[PDB]
Design a protein around this ligand. Structure first.
Ligand SMILES: CCCCCCCCCCCCCCCCCC(=O)OC[C@H](COP(=O)([O-])OCC(O)COP(=O)([O-])OC[C@@H](COC(=O)CCCCCCCCCCCCCCCCC)OC(=O)CCCCCCCCCCCCCCCCC)OC(=O)CCCCCCCCCCCCCCCCC
Ligand SMILES: CCCCCCCCCCCCCCCCCC(=O)OC[C@H](COP(=O)([O-])OCC(O)COP(=O)([O-])OC[C@@H](COC(=O)CCCCCCCCCCCCCCCCC)OC(=O)CCCCCCCCCCCCCCCCC)OC(=O)CCCCCCCCCCCCCCCCC
Ligand SMILES: CCCCCCCC/C=C\CCCCCCCC(=O)OC[C@H](COP(=O)(O)OCCN)OC(=O)CCCCCCC/C=C\CCCCCCCC
Ligand SMILES: CCCCCCCC/C=C\CCCCCCCC(=O)O[C@H](COC(=O)CCCCCCC/C=C/CCCCCCCC)COP(=O)(O)OCCN
Ligand SMILES: *OP(=O)(O)OCC(C)(C)[C@@H](O)C(=O)NCCC(=O)NCCSC(=O)CCCCCCCCCCC
Lengths: 70, 175, 88, 128, 63, 178, 219, 124, 459, 84, 104
């Protein structure tokens, strides 16, 4: 189905430029997809909604009276 | 289709939404269903029309068998083998009919569960209650008879149940 | 697989190529019939190291009982040819 | 000085770790000689029978026949009623039966008591 | 041409047979093919009856 | 495999075998080639420290502590060649090896195909038929009383003679028949 | 029971994989660990998320096994990672495909393994579960990253260690097409499936910053 | 987490129990006690048959999201505003739950300190 | 039913007045025709039965067994053709006569409207089998084996006869219909206990029950091929059929008395399946597999529930077919190797691929692979036992695991591996053996399409 | 059609220890008084295309440059199109 | 039979047996397809101890984790219609005791 490639016996194997450009193209498209998604939907990794601090809340809206009423 | 009875196998009106396309992008589902219709349903429909006209060319009927009632095992003499045989066969036929009734109710329950989707726990309470009543009745009638079941054993089980019920009711009334 | 069928020319060439890379053996004095212990003055440990090198180069390991009695490069070539069913 | 290796039934001692092979003696050497002699005689007989162009059947092996006969048909004539055999047979042939009888009887008595008291919830249990 | 013959004799004939069997025999018996009811959302219109399902309670929209 | 085993292993054979096993397991431990070369030459140096040793007793005291040290650090997952008795393809093609006698059961329609091959097969069968009759007598005369003391077979010593018991050695199915 | 079984399974299988020399055995223990993670997901009452993880794992694990088989066939039936060395440039397509597969397996953001595995860890972080099960799940994630590193390092980075007769070849259309289809799959199918299916669970909208990212730091 | 460490190494009764929350009356904080409102009625919230666990106070936004996803099907990236609104509503529900948790924590603190003060007053 | 009985009798003059070289063809053709005729009995009613006359009646429990009995004879003739080649014409005709008499006795046994006639034919089936085993047997132990196969059976069957006539002195009839209709409970008494034991242990011996199974490995190993097929296929089902027929009179004492036999059968299957794991003989292994399956059938019959009876009937039919096929395959190996040892002949898949496929299918059916009728029977019995008690599932699962283990052990030991080098007389399989395996296996995979025909009267 | 064209072997004078980590090995044995007799045989593993190695991070970032270039081109196009 | 010499020219290479030699009574138990007694790199007792310790420690730690669970600082989730009474179980003719959710 492919082309004839001969053994080498202790030297680097014969490489066709087709597989080289294909591998480079697929790696490039993987990295481009990663960067594109990180740019367009960044809330998937670093989040979107802030986490409130439980101690930062005041006693007014937490339903606490100053230890004397009830 | 008149092939079956709509009262025995009830089905809701099957309300369905209408398409409300919010975009100008044509969907693939509509085109796929159109091409499927054209290449599949039309040849199938034509073949069915040919087959149906061939069947209508030669029309003949078949009938459902009716069985008269016979005296049951309660009105059967102790050693009269003939009436015992008649009552036994009648009881087996009634047993088969009850089995098919339970089958119909179970099919109703299964169809209700599948149809209702995610709200099946609430929308199938009526079918669940119907199956509970039918299963309770069937279990009272035929359970624990054994492999060598007969009308006499069913009668004995019923008689024991009525003895227990009568004793319990008498105790409750006089308490 | 796709492996080419090796000949005894290839086997002999590879055996001599491996033996020449052995700096303990002078490449000019070595021949296909050159004995290891007497003609080359090699110890038993050198012979077993040579056998291991042939194993690593050809990808199959010779059993020790057969390995200790391989004294010439031609013997190794013949043993490998018989093992791998080489015609010509 | 290294941690030692402990052989077991399912992990036997390696040949290289057996001191018995290092207690070399002339009678040991003669024993190995005669062992390989009988092995070579058997191998020679088998090879003579195996390479024969006139033999067109199966080389009958006396060892296989002896193994099968000893496993199957030589048991009872050599059997002797001994305390070991008696207790082993009684245990391995009676104990499991009574154990399973006790387990199943207990379970079924519990189930029947629960049924008689009526607290079992056997609803939908139509097929039995 | 080979792919056309493949699609004709390996896809079209089996789908014809299956469609005939399902549409004229399997669906003849009750409850053989049961569909999950389609989802109904506010604002949808039903083909058979034609009425309009009312909208929601006008929740306060913010952010 | 090819060579018949001796009655025992001499001390030299044991040392050679242990040296090869140690080198193989050290190569298994040292993946990279330069590290393996360094440590293998260190092993050779540590191995030849007692090469010129004289008496058998403490030389056998050695090669016994060595076995224990090897078994302590033997890399419980060593590298195995693919076709070795522990390799991932040890007996992969044993299901493709068909004996030659099966060809005798072929239908004549099947033997109509490949006629030259079956002519050569008939020649081989005739050669075996005569050679066996010669070989049995050669083995009978050559063998010592009480049978062979080893499973080593003599070669052919005459002109037309063939090695005794040769049919099932030269007619091996193949290494990779299919 | 399901949660504990999945946790112990994934932990033990990843720990066994961490030091294997056969490539096929490494990938087998990897898929066993992934099945353990799936069972953990089942144990925390998240079935559809487990099904989604099944779907993504199919793609990237199948492509990983095909790459391993391509390497095995290239080097004349060799499987021990001690005997394949420098293959980053010897076989470029297998190298890049295996790199992408190992990245997706480890939940690299915006790949097919991200959309499932990060949700798995996020759900296991905020459920009323065993502390031990969560700890072993985190350790299993770390060990998954570590054995992916082991495969890549021992098979592609160093100097060659195969026999001298080089038979390395990749130019066969069947292998290239079969690998590339699953490459495109393991790249884009995660996003496509995640964005096409209807919402079947309540999202974990709000998280602590350290708890939201913990999978990333662990990996 | 810190609450886990506080509960499992400090005083167990000082921290709330998630299996018994709430342990205090809901009017104990203030008497107003405004009530939560559900937008979706039973009929429409059953006809859409969302899920039994998706049937919470944020169901209207989920219904809107499902409506768009059915409507603009081929362009699966068509609508993000309803997804964002549903996520915001879920975030609000989660912060209400966290408010409940912290409220019970500080209420238990106040109850414990009040009981300790009463015991000290009785002792003196 | 005389339309099946008369042709089977007419098979005898046809066999005896045939040519010296045309006996096998005539017997096979007419046996196949008789099987085709007997196929008409499969039309059953949901009501009582098919009462042909005062002497013979048919039921949906008798019909599958009768069909299998008729179907087995052509297979037995095909199997027996080979090893009787060097036999004189008179002795070949005598062998065919013995097979025909055995089929006739089984055919009359399975209808048997009255219990005494059933007993008479049930014990008449003993003579042709004994003659077949002890006359045309290869090894020297056949005689010994024959004695076992005789006395065991009689030791169980002699008390039963007594009990039988005793029943006629108390009820006045042994007709099955009247026995069913006029049934009365058995009170707990020592007299009734011994009556139960006498009525039951006759059929427990031939099933066989664990602890009473010793005759079976001997009789199966030392019998010729046709004897082995007829013993494993039909003659083991006589006990099950008799138990199903006679348990209608033993109630409610069956619930009390089933425990000693339920324990022996539930633990017995484990023991026999374990014995199958370590067996150097193929025939003995197949025999012990038969023992395990029949122990499961005993459990099903003793449970006495509708699902139990359905599972027992389906398992009986499926086991008969599968055991006959396994014995035929082992005999095809033996006719080549003349050894009857598993480990000697190995790697036969590389030499005989189609026979290896037949071995694979037979082992898969024996392994109870769904949706075969073997698994239908096993699953029904397992569900019935689970309803009986929830702990039984442990034993059933263990038995399933060991069954799969030893079935695949059988397959791997003989078919896979490397061939034995010194065996060169392994000729290609004849058309006869391949046709035998096909005719064994196709009915199983066809009956899996219509399971209601082998599920018994309680369907 | 197979790989049958009589492939030739290189010359064994080509393999030199020079320029390989085997120099370090040789120096470390020479400090103890030892030599490696098979060091040259393995020189082919460091001679040809195997002379260059890629780091783990470098291997991970196989196609980062082209991807980043395409990403910034796409971002610029998106900005110039949306802000119209 | 797994620990026999694999390089010896056995008559039965798969079985690793020679014609005429006595056969072990338990041969069919050691056939390279079943239990093998080959020596291991680690002593049997050591592997038994390590496996038992690992399993016991894992079970004990799982029990401890069950005793000491992990959760988030949140309250129980709130459901609108009496904790979704009608659609979970049904029973509409009982009018269950109502519960209302505290808005905070
Ligand atoms: C159906 C499903 C499967 C079920 C079927 C299979 C399973 C059930 C059947 C098989 C098992 C049942 C067998 C029962 C016992 C049969 C033994 C027999 O026949 O004796 C012949 C045999 C012939 O006697 P002998 O030839 O004159 O003496 C030879 C002995 O070496 C001389 O030995 P000794 O004199 O030194 O020992 C005698 C002495 C010493 O006993 C002992 O050694 C230990 C004590 C054992 C029993 C006490 C606990 O015994 C006692 O003191 C107490 C005995 C009670 O007697 C024995 O050797 C055995 C005697 C002790 C048997 C103990 C059995 C008890 C187990 C439970 C019952
Ligand atoms: C299921 C889809 C298929 C439908 C298409 C119809 C196919 C026709 C099948 C005819 C029945 C098989 C008869 C057995 C003897 C075969 C005769 C022979 O000598 O073969 C040589 C012949 C020529 O090749 P050769 O070069 O001479 O080879 C020589 C060597 O022997 C080399 O031989 P080999 O190495 O090539 O081995 C031959 C092959 C074949 O040999 C066998 O072992 C066949 C045995 C199959 C099952 C074994 C018993 C287990 C119980 C299952 C019973 C189910 C029966 C269903 C009704 C059957 C109606 C007759 O062995 C296998 O591959 C193992 C198969 C085991 C699979 C286990 C799962 C089976 C049950 C799956 C569910 C089935 C119902 C699903 C219901 C729900 C969905 C609709 O090759 C074939 O014809 C092979 C047969 C096709 C494979 C059948 C495997 C599954 C089909 C089961 C029954 C059909 C179901 C129909 C459903 C329609 C929708
Ligand atoms: C319950 C199971 C009881 C144990 C089953 C006993 C079976 C006995 C007969 C087995 C037949 C012999 C056999 O199969 O050969 C052993 C064969 C050869 O060994 P290899 O490791 O493959 O060697 C390869 C390298 N040369 O190995 C096996 O297959 C043995 C497998 C038996 C498993 C037994 C142990 C399993 C115990 C499971 C209990 C845990 C249950 C899990 C609960 C899950 C929680 C819900
Ligand atoms: C291969 C071994 C299998 C052999 C098994 C044989 C055992 C069968 C069970 C005992 C056989 C005889 C039982 C009697 C036959 C039933 C007839 C009957 O029911 O009549 C009884 C008669 O009952 C008896 O006669 C029983 C006496 C038994 C004497 C012989 C005992 C033999 C051994 C019994 C113990 C073993 C039990 C299990 C068998 C184990 C074999 C392995 C009623 O008595 P009536 O005279 O009518 O009085 C009525 C007014 N009151
Ligand atoms: O001349 P040859 O035929 O080649 O014989 C070689 C040799 C001279 C060594 C031999 O024949 C001989 O005569 N030896 C005389 C004495 C002797 O050598 N005694 C044995 C010495 S023991 C030893 O060398 C210590 C080895 C320690 C290293 C063990 C390896 C551990 C590896 C662990 C896993 C990596």
């Amino acid at each position: 189905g492919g082309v004839h490639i001969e053994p080498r016996y202790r030297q680097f194997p014969q490489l066709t430029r087709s597989q080289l450009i294909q591998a480079e193209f697929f790696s490039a498209t993987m990295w481009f997809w990663i960067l594109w998604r990180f740019w367009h939907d960044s809330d998937a990794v670093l989040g979107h909604f802030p986490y409130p601090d439980p101690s930062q809340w005041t006693d007014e809206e937490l339903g606490i009276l100053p230890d004397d009423e009830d | 289709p008149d092939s079956w009875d709509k009262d025995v196998y009830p089905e809701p009106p099957r309300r369905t939404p209408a398409p409300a396309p919010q975009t100008s992008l044509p969907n693939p589902v509509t085109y796929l269903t159109k091409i499927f219709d054209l290449l599949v349903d039309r040849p199938v429909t034509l073949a069915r029309e040919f087959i149906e006209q061939q069947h209508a060319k030669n029309r003949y009927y078949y009938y459902h068998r009716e069985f008269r009632r016979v005296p049951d095992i309660t009105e059967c003499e102790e050693k009269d083998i003939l009436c015992m045989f008649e009552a036994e066969m009648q009881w087996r036929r009634d047993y088969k009919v009850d089995q098919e009734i339970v089958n119909i109710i179970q099919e109703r329950l299964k169809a209700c569960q599948q149809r209702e989707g995610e709200s099946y726990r609430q929308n199938c309470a009526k079918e669940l209650e119907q199956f509970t009543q039918v299963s309770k009745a069937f279990q009272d009638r035929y359970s624990d008879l054994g492999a060598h079941y007969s009308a006499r054993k069913c009668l004995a089980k019923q008689k024991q149940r009525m003895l227990a019920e009568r004793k319990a009711a008498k105790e409750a009334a006089a308490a | 697989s796709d492996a080419p069928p090796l000949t005894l020319e290839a086997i002999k060439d590879r055996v001599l190529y491996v033996l020449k890379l052995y700096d303990k053996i002078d490449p000019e004095k070595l021949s296909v019939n050159s004995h290891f212990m007497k003609d080359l003055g090699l110890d038993s440990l050198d012979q077993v190291e040579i056998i291991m090198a042939m194993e690593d180069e050809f990808g199959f390991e010779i059993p020790d009982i057969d390995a200790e009695k391989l004294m010439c490069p031609q013997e190794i070539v013949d043993y490998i040819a018989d093992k791998k069913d080489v015609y010509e | 000085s290294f941690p030692k290796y402990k052989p077991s039934r399912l992990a036997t001692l390696p040949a290289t770790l057996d001191p018995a092979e290092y207690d070399i003696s002339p009678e040991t050497r003669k024993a190995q000689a005669e062992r390989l002699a009988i092995r070579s005689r058997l191998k020679r007989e088998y090879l003579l029978q195996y390479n024969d162009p006139n033999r067109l059947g199966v080389i009958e092996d006396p060892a296989l026949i002896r193994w099968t006969y000893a496993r199957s048909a030589n048991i009872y004539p050599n059997f002797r009623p001994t305390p070991k055999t008696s207790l082993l047979g009684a245990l391995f042939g009676i104990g499991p039966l009574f154990f399973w009888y006790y387990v199943f009887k207990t379970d079924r008595d519990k189930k029947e008591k629960l049924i008689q008291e009526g607290k079992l919830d056997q609803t939908f249990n139509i097929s039995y | 041409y080979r792919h056309s013959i493949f699609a004709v004799t390996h896809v079209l004939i089996p789908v014809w047979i299956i469609h005939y069997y399902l549409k004229y025999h399997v669906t003849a018996k009750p409850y053989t093919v049961v569909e999950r009811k389609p989802r109904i959302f506010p604002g949808d219109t039903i083909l058979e009856t034609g009425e309009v399902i009312p909208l929601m309670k006008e929740f306060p929209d913010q952010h | 495999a090819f060579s018949a085993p001796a009655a025992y292993l001499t001390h030299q054979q044991k040392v050679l075998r242990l040296y090869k096993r140690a080198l193989r397991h050290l190569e298994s431990w040292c993946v990279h080639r330069d590290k393996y070369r360094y440590f293998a030459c260190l092993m050779r140096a540590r191995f030849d420290e007692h090469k010129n040793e004289k008496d058998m007793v403490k030389a056998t005291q050695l090669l016994r502590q060595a076995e224990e040290e090897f078994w302590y650090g033997q890399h419980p997952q060593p590298y195995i060649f693919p076709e070795s008795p522990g390799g991932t393809s040890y007996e992969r093609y044993e299901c493709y090896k068909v004996p030659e006698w099966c060809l005798d059961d072929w239908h004549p329609s099947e033997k109509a195909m490949y006629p030259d091959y079956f002519a050569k097969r008939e020649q081989w069968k005739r050669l075996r038929r005569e050679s066996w009759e010669r070989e049995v007598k050669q083995l009978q005369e050559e063998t010592p009383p009480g049978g062979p003391r080893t499973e080593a077979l003599p070669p052919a010593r005459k002109e037309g003679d063939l090695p005794p018991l040769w049919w099932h050695i030269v007619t091996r199915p193949r290494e990779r028949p299919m | 029971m399901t949660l504990c079984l999945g946790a112990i399974t994934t932990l033990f299988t990843a720990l066994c994989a961490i030091t294997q020399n056969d490539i096929k055995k490494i990938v087998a223990f990897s898929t066993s660990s992934q099945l353990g993670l799936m069972m953990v997901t089942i144990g925390i009452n998240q079935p559809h998320l487990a099904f989604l993880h099944i779907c993504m794992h199919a793609f990237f694990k199948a492509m990983l096994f095909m790459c391993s088989g391509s390497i095995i066939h290239s080097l004349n039936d060799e499987q021990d990672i001690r005997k394949m060395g420098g293959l980053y440039k010897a076989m470029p397509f297998t190298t890049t495909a295996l790199i992408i597969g190992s990245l997706a397996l480890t939940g690299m953001p915006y790949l097919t393994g991200f959309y499932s595995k990060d949700l798995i860890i996020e759900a296991v972080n905020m459920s009323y579960t065993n502390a031990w099960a969560l700890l072993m799940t985190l350790i299993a994630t770390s060990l998954t990253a570590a054995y992916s590193t082991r495969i890549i390092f021992f098979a592609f980075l160093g100097k060659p260690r195969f026999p001298p007769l080089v038979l390395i070849n990749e130019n066969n259309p069947l292998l290239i097409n079969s690998i590339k289809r699953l490459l495109i799959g393991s790249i884009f199918a995660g996003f496509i499936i995640s964005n096409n299916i209807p919402p079947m669970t309540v999202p974990n909208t709000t998280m602590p910053l350290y708890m939201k990212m913990t999978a990333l730091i662990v990996t | 987490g810190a609450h886990l460490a506080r509960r499992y190494l400090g005083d167990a009764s000082k921290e709330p129990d998630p299996l018994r929350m709430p342990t205090f009356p809901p009017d104990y904080g203030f008497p107003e006690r405004k009530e939560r409102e559900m937008v979706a009625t039973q009929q429409e919230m059953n006809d859409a048959q969302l899920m039994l666990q998706q049937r919470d106070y944020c169901a209207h936004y989920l219904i809107q999201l499902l409506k768009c996803k059915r409507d603009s099907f081929p362009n699966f990236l068509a609508c993000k505003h309803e997804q964002h609104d549903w996520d915001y509503c879920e975030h609000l529900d989660y912060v209400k739950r966290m408010k409940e948790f912290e409220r019970e924590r500080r209420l238990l603190q106040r109850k414990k300190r009040r009981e300790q003060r009463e015991a000290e007053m009785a002792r003196g | 039913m005389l339309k099946i009985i008369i042709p089977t009798t007419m098979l005898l003059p046809m066999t005896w007045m045939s040519k010296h070289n045309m006996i096998w063809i005539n017997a096979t053709v007419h046996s196949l025709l008789i099987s085709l005729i007997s196929l008409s009995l499969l039309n059953q009613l949901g009501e009582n039965s098919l009462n042909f006359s005062l002497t013979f009646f048919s039921d949906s429990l008798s019909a599958p067994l009768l069909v299998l009995t008729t179907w087995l004879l052509p297979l037995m003739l095909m199997a027996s053709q080979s090893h009787l080649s060097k036999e004189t014409t008179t002795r070949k005709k005598l062998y065919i006569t013995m097979l025909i008499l055995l089929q006739l006795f089984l055919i009359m046994t399975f209808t048997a409207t009255e219990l005494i006639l059933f007993y008479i034919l049930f014990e008449a089936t003993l003579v042709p089998t004994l003659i077949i085993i002890t006359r045309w047997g290869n090894q020297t132990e056949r005689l010994n084996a024959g004695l076992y196969f005789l006395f065991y059976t009689l030791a169980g069957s002699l008390p039963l006869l007594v009990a039988l006539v005793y029943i006629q002195n108390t009820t006045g009839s042994l007709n099955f219909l009247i026995i069913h209709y006029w049934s009365h409970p058995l009170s707990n008494s020592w007299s009734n206990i011994f009556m139960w034991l006498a009525c039951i242990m006759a059929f427990m011996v031939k099933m066989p029950l664990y602890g009473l199974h010793l005759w079976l490995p001997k009789a199966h190993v030392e019998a010729p091929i046709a004897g082995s097929m007829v013993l494993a296929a039909v003659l083991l089902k006589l006990g099950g059929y008799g138990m199903m027929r006679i348990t209608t009179i033993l109630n409610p004492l069956t619930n009390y008395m089933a425990y000693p036999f339920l324990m022996l059968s539930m633990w017995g299957m484990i023991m026999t399946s374990s014995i199958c794991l370590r067996q150097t003989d193929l025939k003995s292994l197949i025999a012990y597999s038969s023992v395990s399956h029949m122990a499961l059938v005993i459990v099903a019959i003793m449970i006495q529930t509708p699902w139990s009876f359905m599972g027992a009937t389906a398992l009986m039919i499926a086991h008969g077919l599968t055991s006959s096929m396994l014995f035929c395959l082992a005999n095809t190996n033996y006719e080549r190797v003349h050894s009857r040892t598993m480990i000697l002949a190995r790697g036969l898949q590389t030499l005989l691929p189609l026979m290896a496929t037949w071995w694979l299918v037979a082992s898969l059916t024996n392994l109870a692979l769904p949706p075969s009728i073997n698994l239908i029977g096993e699953l029904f019995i397992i569900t019935a036992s689970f309803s009986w008690s929830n702990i039984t599932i442990i034993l059933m699962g263990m038995n399933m695991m060991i069954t799969a283990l030893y079935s695949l052990y059988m397959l791997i030991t003989t078919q896979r591996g490397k061939y034995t080098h010194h065996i060169n007389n392994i000729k290609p399989s004849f058309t006869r053996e391949n046709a035998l395996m096909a005719l064994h296996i196709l009915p199983l995979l066809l009956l899996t399409l219509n399971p209601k025909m082998i599920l018994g009267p309680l369907y | 059609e197979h790989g049958h064209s009589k492939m030739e072997l290189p010359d064994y004078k080509q393999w030199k220890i020079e320029g390989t980590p085997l120099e370090t090995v040789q120096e470390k044995l020479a400090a103890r008084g030892l030599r490696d007799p098979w060091g040259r045989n393995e020189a082919w593993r460091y001679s040809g295309g195997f002379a260059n190695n890629v780091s783990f991070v470098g291997a991970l970032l196989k196609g980062f440059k082209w991807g980043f270039a395409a990403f910034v081109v796409a971002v610029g196009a998106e900005y110039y199109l949306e802000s119209q | 039979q797994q620990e026999r010499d694999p390089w010896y020219d056995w008559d039965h290479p798969d079985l690793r047996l020679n014609w005429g030699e006595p056969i072990h009574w338990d041969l069919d138990m050691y056939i390279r397809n079943r239990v093998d007694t080959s020596p291991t790199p680690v002593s049997w007792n050591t592997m038994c101890k390590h496996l038992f310790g690992f399993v016991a420690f894992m079970l004990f730690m799982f029990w401890v984790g069950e005793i000491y669970p992990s959760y988030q600082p949140v309250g129980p989730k709130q459901y609108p219609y009496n904790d979704l009474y009608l659609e979970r179980g049904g029973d509409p003719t009982k009018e269950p005791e109502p519960v209302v959710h505290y808005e905070i």
